[PDB]
């Protein structure tokens, strides 16, 4: 009862809003979006700001608010920061990836602001009895 908390399993499809699979071309080395999360199997990555000149920005079919589920077969679903950053930082200019991401969650509290264990509380969350 009182399920007013963010649901979790790994399921892209549990995730609400819009589930999209969009290709981001590794442009200018890496991507060009800042993403918060991916700390544990329990914590997924989420876009907190799309960096202008980023392939998300550019492709326009990915926006701040997409939650990063997986990418180019790689199970980045609950990927550890060190691991996810390793992939995302090592990529070359001119490459391609298929982003499996789910958007619909509006960016509420700033995950840009440290000094706290960052758990942003999202609206448009199910406040079910």
């Amino acid at each position: 009862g009182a399920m007013g908390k963010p649901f979790f399993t790994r399921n892209p499809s549990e995730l609400k809003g819009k589930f999209i699979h969009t290709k981001l071309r590794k442009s200018s080395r890496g991507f060009g979006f800042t993403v918060v999360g991916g700390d544990e199997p329990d914590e997924f990555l989420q876009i907190k700001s799309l960096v202008l000149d980023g392939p998300a920005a550019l492709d326009g079919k990915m926006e701040t608010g997409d939650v990063i589920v997986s990418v180019n077969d790689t199970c980045v679903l609950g990927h550890t920061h060190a691991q996810v950053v390793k992939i995302f930082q090592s990529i070359p200019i001119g490459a391609s990836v298929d982003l499996e991401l789910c958007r619909g969650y509006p960016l509420p509290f700033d995950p840009d602001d440290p000094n706290t264990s960052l758990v942003t509380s999202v609206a448009i969350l199910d406040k079910e009895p």
Binding site: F31, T34, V35, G37, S117, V119
Partner: peptide, 11 residues
């Protein structure tokens, strides 16, 4: 120590 904190991965 802390677990629930989403990390800034600027890519």
């Amino acid at each position: 120590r802390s677990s629930r904190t989403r990390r800034e991965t600027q890519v």
